[PDB]
Amino acid sequence: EGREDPQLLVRVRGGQLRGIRLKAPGGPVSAFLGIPFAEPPVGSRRFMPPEPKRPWSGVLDATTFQNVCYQYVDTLYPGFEGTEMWNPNRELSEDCLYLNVWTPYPRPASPTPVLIWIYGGGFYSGAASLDVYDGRFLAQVEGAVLVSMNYRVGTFGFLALPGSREAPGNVGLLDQRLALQWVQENIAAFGGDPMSVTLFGESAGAASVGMHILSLPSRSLFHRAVLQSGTPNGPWATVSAGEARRRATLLARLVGCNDTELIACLRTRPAQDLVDHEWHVLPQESIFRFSFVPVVDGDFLSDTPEALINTGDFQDLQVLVGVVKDEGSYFLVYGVPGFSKDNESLISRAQFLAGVRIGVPQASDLAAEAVVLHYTDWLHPEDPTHLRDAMSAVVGDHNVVCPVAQLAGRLAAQGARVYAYIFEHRASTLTWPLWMGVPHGYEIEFIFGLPLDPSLNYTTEERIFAQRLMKYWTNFARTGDPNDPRDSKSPQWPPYTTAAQQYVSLNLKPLEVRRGLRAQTCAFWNRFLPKLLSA
Amino acid sequence: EDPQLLVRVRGGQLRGIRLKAPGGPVSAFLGIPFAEPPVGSRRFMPPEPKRPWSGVLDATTFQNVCYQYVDTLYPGFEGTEMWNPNRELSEDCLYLNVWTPYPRPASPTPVLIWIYGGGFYSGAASLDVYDGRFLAQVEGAVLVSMNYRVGTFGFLALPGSREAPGNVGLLDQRLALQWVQENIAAFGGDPMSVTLFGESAGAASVGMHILSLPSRSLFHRAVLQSGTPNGPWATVSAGEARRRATLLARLVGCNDTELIACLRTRPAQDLVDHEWHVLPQESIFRFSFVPVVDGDFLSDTPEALINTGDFQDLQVLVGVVKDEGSYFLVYGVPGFSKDNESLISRAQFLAGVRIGVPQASDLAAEAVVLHYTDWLHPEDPTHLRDAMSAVVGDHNVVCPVAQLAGRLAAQGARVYAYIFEHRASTLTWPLWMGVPHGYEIEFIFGLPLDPSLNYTTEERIFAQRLMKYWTNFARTGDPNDPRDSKSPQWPPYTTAAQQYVSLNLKPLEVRRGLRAQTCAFWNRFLPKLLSAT
Ligand SMILES: CCN(CC)CCNS(=O)(=O)Cc1ccc(C)cc1
Ligand SMILES: CCN(CC)CCNS(=O)(=O)Cc1ccc(C)cc1
Ligand SMILES: *[C@@H]1O[C@H](CO)[C@@H](O)[C@H](O)[C@H]1NC(C)=O
Ligand SMILES: *[C@@H]1O[C@H](CO)[C@@H](O)[C@H](O)[C@H]1NC(C)=O
Ligand SMILES: *[C@@H]1O[C@H](CO)[C@@H](O)[C@H](O)[C@H]1NC(C)=O
Numbered sequence A: 001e002g003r004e005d006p007q008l009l010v011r012v013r014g015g016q017l018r019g020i021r022l023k024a025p026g027g028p029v030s031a032f033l034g035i036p037f038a039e040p041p042v043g044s045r046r047f048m049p050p051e052p053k054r055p056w057s058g059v060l061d062a063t064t065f066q067n068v069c070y071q072y073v074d075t076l077y078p079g080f081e082g083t084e085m086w087n088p089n090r091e092l093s094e095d096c097l098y099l100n101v102w103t104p105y106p107r108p109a110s111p112t113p114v115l116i117w118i119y120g121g122g123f124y125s126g127a128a129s130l131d132v133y134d135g136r137f138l139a140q141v142e143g144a145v146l147v148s149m150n151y152r153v154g155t156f157g158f159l160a161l162p163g164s165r166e167a168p169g170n171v172g173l174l175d176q177r178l179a180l181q182w183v184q185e186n187i188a189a190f191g192g193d194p195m196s197v198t199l200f201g202e203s204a205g206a207a208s209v210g211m212h213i214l215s216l217p218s219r220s221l222f223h224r225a226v227l228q229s230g231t232p233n234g235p236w237a238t239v240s241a242g243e244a245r246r247r248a249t250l251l252a253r254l255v256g257c258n259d260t261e262l263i264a265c266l267r268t269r270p271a272q273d274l275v276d277h278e279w280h281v282l283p284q285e286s287i288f289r290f291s292f293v294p295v296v297d298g299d300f301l302s303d304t305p306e307a308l309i310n311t312g313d314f315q316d317l318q319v320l321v322g323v324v325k326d327e328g329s330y331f332l333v334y335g336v337p338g339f340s341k342d343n344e345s346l347i348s349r350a351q352f353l354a355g356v357r358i359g360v361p362q363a364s365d366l367a368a369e370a371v372v373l374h375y376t377d378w379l380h381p382e383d384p385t386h387l388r389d390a391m392s393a394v395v396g397d398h399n400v401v402c403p404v405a406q407l408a409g410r411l412a413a414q415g416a417r418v419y420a421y422i423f424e425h426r427a428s429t430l431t432w433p434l435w436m437g438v439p440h441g442y443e444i445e446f447i448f449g450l451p452l453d454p455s456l457n458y459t460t461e462e463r464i465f466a467q468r469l470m471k472y473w474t475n476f477a478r479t480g481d482p483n484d485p486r487d488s489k490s491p492q493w494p495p496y497t498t499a500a501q502q503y504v505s506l507n508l509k510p511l512e513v514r515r516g517l518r519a520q521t522c523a524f525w526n527r528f529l530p531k532l533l534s535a
Numbered sequence B: 001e002d003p004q005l006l007v008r009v010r011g012g013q014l015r016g017i018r019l020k021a022p023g024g025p026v027s028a029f030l031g032i033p034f035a036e037p038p039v040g041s042r043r044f045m046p047p048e049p050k051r052p053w054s055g056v057l058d059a060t061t062f063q064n065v066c067y068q069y070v071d072t073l074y075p076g077f078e079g080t081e082m083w084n085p086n087r088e089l090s091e092d093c094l095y096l097n098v099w100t101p102y103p104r105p106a107s108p109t110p111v112l113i114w115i116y117g118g119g120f121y122s123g124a125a126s127l128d129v130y131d132g133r134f135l136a137q138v139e140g141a142v143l144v145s146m147n148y149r150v151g152t153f154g155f156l157a158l159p160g161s162r163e164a165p166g167n168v169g170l171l172d173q174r175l176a177l178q179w180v181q182e183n184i185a186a187f188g189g190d191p192m193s194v195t196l197f198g199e200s201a202g203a204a205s206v207g208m209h210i211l212s213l214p215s216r217s218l219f220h221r222a223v224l225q226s227g228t229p230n231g232p233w234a235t236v237s238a239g240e241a242r243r244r245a246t247l248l249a250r251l252v253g254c255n256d257t258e259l260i261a262c263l264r265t266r267p268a269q270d271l272v273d274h275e276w277h278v279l280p281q282e283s284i285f286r287f288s289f290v291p292v293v294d295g296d297f298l299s300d301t302p303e304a305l306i307n308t309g310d311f312q313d314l315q316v317l318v319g320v321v322k323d324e325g326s327y328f329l330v331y332g333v334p335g336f337s338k339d340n341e342s343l344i345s346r347a348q349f350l351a352g353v354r355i356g357v358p359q360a361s362d363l364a365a366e367a368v369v370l371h372y373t374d375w376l377h378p379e380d381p382t383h384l385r386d387a388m389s390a391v392v393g394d395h396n397v398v399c400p401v402a403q404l405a406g407r408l409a410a411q412g413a414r415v416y417a418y419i420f421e422h423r424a425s426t427l428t429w430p431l432w433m434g435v436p437h438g439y440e441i442e443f444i445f446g447l448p449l450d451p452s453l454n455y456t457t458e459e460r461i462f463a464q465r466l467m468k469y470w471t472n473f474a475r476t477g478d479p480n481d482p483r484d485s486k487s488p489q490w491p492p493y494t495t496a497a498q499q500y501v502s503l504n505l506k507p508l509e510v511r512r513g514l515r516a517q518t519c520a521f522w523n524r525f526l527p528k529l530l531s532a533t
Helices: A136-142 A154-158 A171-190 A204-214 A241-254 A259-266 A271-281 A305-311 A349-359 A365-375 A384-413 A460-479 A519-533 B133-139 B151-155 B168-187 B201-211 B238-251 B256-264 B268-272 B302-308 B346-356 B362-372 B381-410 B457-476 B516-530
Strands: A009-012 A015-018 A020-024 A027-036 A059-061 A098-104 A112-118 A145-149 A192-202 A224-228 A318-324 A417-423 A502-506 A512-515 B006-009 B012-015 B017-021 B024-033 B056-058 B095-101 B109-115 B142-146 B189-199 B221-225 B315-321 B414-420 B499-503 B509-512
Touching (some): A009 A171, A027 A059, A027 A136, A098 A136, A098 A171, A112 A171, A112 A204, A112 A460, A136 A145, A136 A460, A145 A171, A145 A192, A154 A271, A171 A192, A171 A204, A192 A460, A204 A224, A204 A305, A241 A271, A305 A384, A318 A460, A349 A384, A365 A384, A365 B516, A384 A417, A384 A519, A519 B362, B006 B168, B017 B133, B024 B056, B024 B133, B109 B168, B109 B201, B133 B142, B133 B457, B142 B168, B142 B189, B168 B189, B189 B457, B201 B221, B201 B302, B315 B381, B315 B457, B346 B362, B381 B414, B381 B516
Parallel strands (some): A015 A059, A112 A145, A112 A192, A192 A224, A224 A318, A318 A417, B109 B142, B109 B189, B189 B221, B221 B315, B315 B414, B414 B499
Antiparallel strands (some): A009 A015, A020 A027, A027 A098, A098 A145, A502 A512, B024 B095, B095 B142, B499 B509
C-alpha cells in the first residue's frame, strides 16, 4: 500500500483486504467482494460441514465477485433475460464459499445496522453476485451495511445420508451459518453493528432465514428476519431423513456408485455428473419440487418446521413476511402441458386436472379432486382463461401463500411482531408475458433499488416506489418497524395479528390495509388437506 | 237447491258450498272421498277406489286429518300451530277438496293439484295456508288438494311383504290424481292440463310422481317448492325401512305377516308415540317413515333415476326460500331458540353439524365446518348461528334442488328456478330465522288478499304477482305474463347460464348460480368423501 486508496483497506480475522470504490447514481460506495469465509469444500470435503477459512498472508484482493457454487443451469429459454438474469454470472466451482460486503464510502464511523441477504433458487441454484442482488443502492441511499454470501446448493449443499459422518445433511445451511458468524466477528471492521443484524431472503433464501429462526445455534447470530415468498414449513423446503436417504442413494446409483463407501465413490465423480442427474431423483413428475433441500435431521432442525413453529416461543422476534401477486405462474412453464411464455396459455379442463397432479404431486386422487373442485369456477367450469389462472393459483397457494399465512399466524399467536405484505406491482421492464402477472422473484429488483439505475428504463414512479420499499426494509432492519417516525402523513403499516389479520398492498399507490391472507382458501390447504391425505 | 253447487261424479252426487272470497263467491267441494277408508285390515295397505254412494253426499265441510304426530314445542304459538291439524285426527282420512270459480267455468279450466308437506309425518289439506279460494276467485283456477296418509300409516314398509309394501301414502296421492282424471271435467276442470305443486315433502312427492311411470299419465307439469325426491331425507333404502319398521314393532310389543298383524291391533297413538325413536341418529331434518326405494313405485334411487331420465316434454318450476334451515335448528340443536337471538359458540357449531349432517363421518363433518367457517371471524356467534342455518338449508334443500334442476335441464326439461326472499310483515318467528321453510306458501295461495290478516298493500300486490306466475306456469309451462312485455322476463334455468330469479317486493332480478361453489361441495365432493369414510 501507500499509493492506493486508504479508505478501501480493511483487516478481518483471516487477514488484510483491499476493496473497491464503486460508482452509484447518488455517489460512491465501498465494496469488498469475494471474501473467503470457509476452506474450499472440495475433494474429501465434498458433502462435509464447512470449516473456517484459514488466515492468508498479504493483501487479499476483494474487488471482484468469486465463483458461483456448482449448479444446474437453466436451458428452457436461452438468451431470454427473464431466465438468464437468475443464471450464474461467474465461473461454476465447488470452491465457492465467499461473501460480499457493501458499505457507504467513506465507511460509517458509527456502528451501522447490517442486512444479510440469502439468495433463493430452490436450494439447487443461485448466487450472491447476480445483478438483482447488487447492494450498492441500499448502501448508498440508505447507508446500509449489506452482506451476502454464497452457500452450496444441490447435491453439494444438501445431499444427505442422515446419521452418517460423511454426508450429514444441511451443509449449505451450515455455510450460511458460518457466514453469519463471520459477520458477528468481523463486520465491525467495516463499520457494521453486529448487535443489529437483520436477515432477508426470497424463496429458498426465505426458507433458509426461517430455518435459522428455528435452529438454536443460529439464534445468537441475528436479531430480525424478513421472509419474501418462502417459508421453512410447507411442501418443498424440507424432506424427511428417509426421503433424503432414498434420494441420495438413488443419485449414487444413477452416477454408478455402507454409507462411507457410497460417499467415497460419489466424491470421485465430476461435479457436473452429479448436476446432470440431480432432477432424476424426484419421486414424482412435479413442479415446485427440488431434489436436494434441507433435511429434518434432528440436529440443525430438531423436528419438522411445522412442529417447531407450533410449539415455539417467538416473544422477542420481529419478522416481516410477504408474497407477490402471482407466485405460481413462473413454475407452470417448466412442466405443466399447455403452458408457455410465448402464448396465452389458455388450457382445457383436462389439462387443468393433469396440471393439478403435477402441481400437487403428493396428492391422492381424492385430494386432487378436492383441489380441482375448490378451484373450479362453477359458473364457467370450462373457461380456459379462468382454468389457466386457477392452475397458477393452485401452485402459488400450495407452495407459498398458504405456508406464509400459516407461518404468520403461528408466529403472531406465539409472541412475534409480524408485518405482512402483498407485492402487486408488475415492472414495466418485465420480459415475461402479461398472463404471468407479478411472478415469483419480481419484487427483488425493487427492494434492492435497481430502478435507481437510469440505464434500466424504469418509470419515474417505479423509481419513487423502489425508494419507498428500501425505506420500509431498512426501517424494519433499524427498528423492527417498517413505518417511518418522522412521517405521520403516509398511512401506517399495522402488524399482522391473529385477531385482525392485517397486511398491506405494496404498489404504486399509497399503502392500503387489507384483512385476511387468503383465509378461506388457506384453511383448505392448511387445515383440511393434511387430514385428507392422512386417511 | 243451488245447481252450481250440485255435481255428479262417478261415485254419485255431491253438494258443495258457496264461499265468500274478498272479490266474489267461489264454489267449494270439501271432504270428497276418493278411497275406501284405510282402516282395520287395510292399515299399511295400498288404497282402494271409493265405492259408489246413494243420494247427495254432503261436500260442504273439511274431512278428518290423517292420523299423525302433533307438534308440542311451542304450545299456542301461531308459528307452529298454523301447521298443526285443524280437524279431528282419524285413519279414515282419504278425502280431497276442490275449489272452482262461482259459477263453474264455462270452458275446460287448467287444474292445480296441491300436495302438502310436513316431512311425510304430518300435514293436511284443510290448513288455512292451503285455502284454494283465492286462486280460484282471482285467477279462475280449478284447485284440488288431497289428504294422504303420513307417518307409519302412510310409509311403514316391510319391503317385499304383501301386507306392508311401502309407499302407500304415495299411492293415496296417485289415486287422487286418477280421481281428478276421471271426475274433474264435471267441475269445469281440464284433465288434459294438470299441474302438480307441493312444498317440502309435498315437493318431494311431486318429484316422485315425475320419477314413477304410472303417475306420468296423470299430470303434465310440476312445481317443486323447497323439496326434492333426491337428497338425504326424502327416501330410505329397503334395508333401512325394514329396520325401522321392525324396531317400531318391537317398541310396541310386536315373519312379516305376523308382525304386521300385531301392528294392526295397535291403537294409532301407540304407533305415533314411538315414531321418532327409530331414527338411527340424533338428527334434524330427518323423518322416520318416508318413501322407500322399493323397485316398484321407485324402480331405483331418485338420484339414479334423474341421472338417466329422459325429461324432454316436462316443464318444471323449482325454488327455495332464503333461510331453509332456520326452522329446524330449534327442534334439536343446542343453543337455538325462537325466544332469543341464538348466538352460539364454536363448539356448539361443531355439535350442531353432527346433528344436521348425521350421516357424516368425523372427516366429513370437519370438511363441513371448515367450509362454512368464516376464517376472518371464526368465533363470531352471529356468523356461526347463520352458518348453522345455512348448513342445514344447503344440505337438505338448496343443493338437492340445484342438483335436480341441473339434471332436468341437461336431460331435456324446461326448468324455471327462483329464490323466495320476502319475509312477511306478519311473521311470528324471530328475525334471526329470516325467511323460513314454508313461508312462501301463504303468498302463492293469496292469503294477503284477506283484509283481516293485516298484510301490507305491497305484500298484497306481491301475492297477486306470485299467483300470476304460478297459474301462468300451470296454463302454459311458462311463468312469464304474455300481457306483460319486459318486466324483465324470467329465463329458463340451464346448465350453462344457471339463471334463476329472486322473488321479493322488488321487480324480478335475474341471478346466475344457485349456491354454485357450495353446492359443488355438497353435490360433488362430500359423497366421494363418505364413499371412503
Ligand atoms: C424466480 C426466482 N428463482 C430464484 C430466486 C429463479 C429460478 N428458480 S425457481 O425455483 O424460481 C423456478 C424453477 C424451477 C425449476 C426449474 C428447472 C427452473 C426454474
Ligand atoms: C314449516 C313447514 N312444515 C310444513 C310444510 C311445518 C313443520 N314440519 S317441518 O318438517 O318443516 C319442521 C319440523 C321438523 C320436525 C319436528 C318435530 C317439527 C317440525
Ligand atoms: C402454448 O404453447 C405450448 C408449447 O408450445 C403448447 O403446448 C400449447 O398448445 C400452446 N397453446 C396454444 C393454444 O397455442
Ligand atoms: C432502454 O433504453 C433504450 C431505449 O430507449 C435502449 O437502448 C436500452 O437498451 C434500454 N435498456 C434496457 C436494459 O432495457
Ligand atoms: C336461547 O334460549 C335457549 C333455551 O331457552 C338457551 O339454551 C340459550 O342459551 C339461549 N341463548 C342465549 C341467550 O345465549
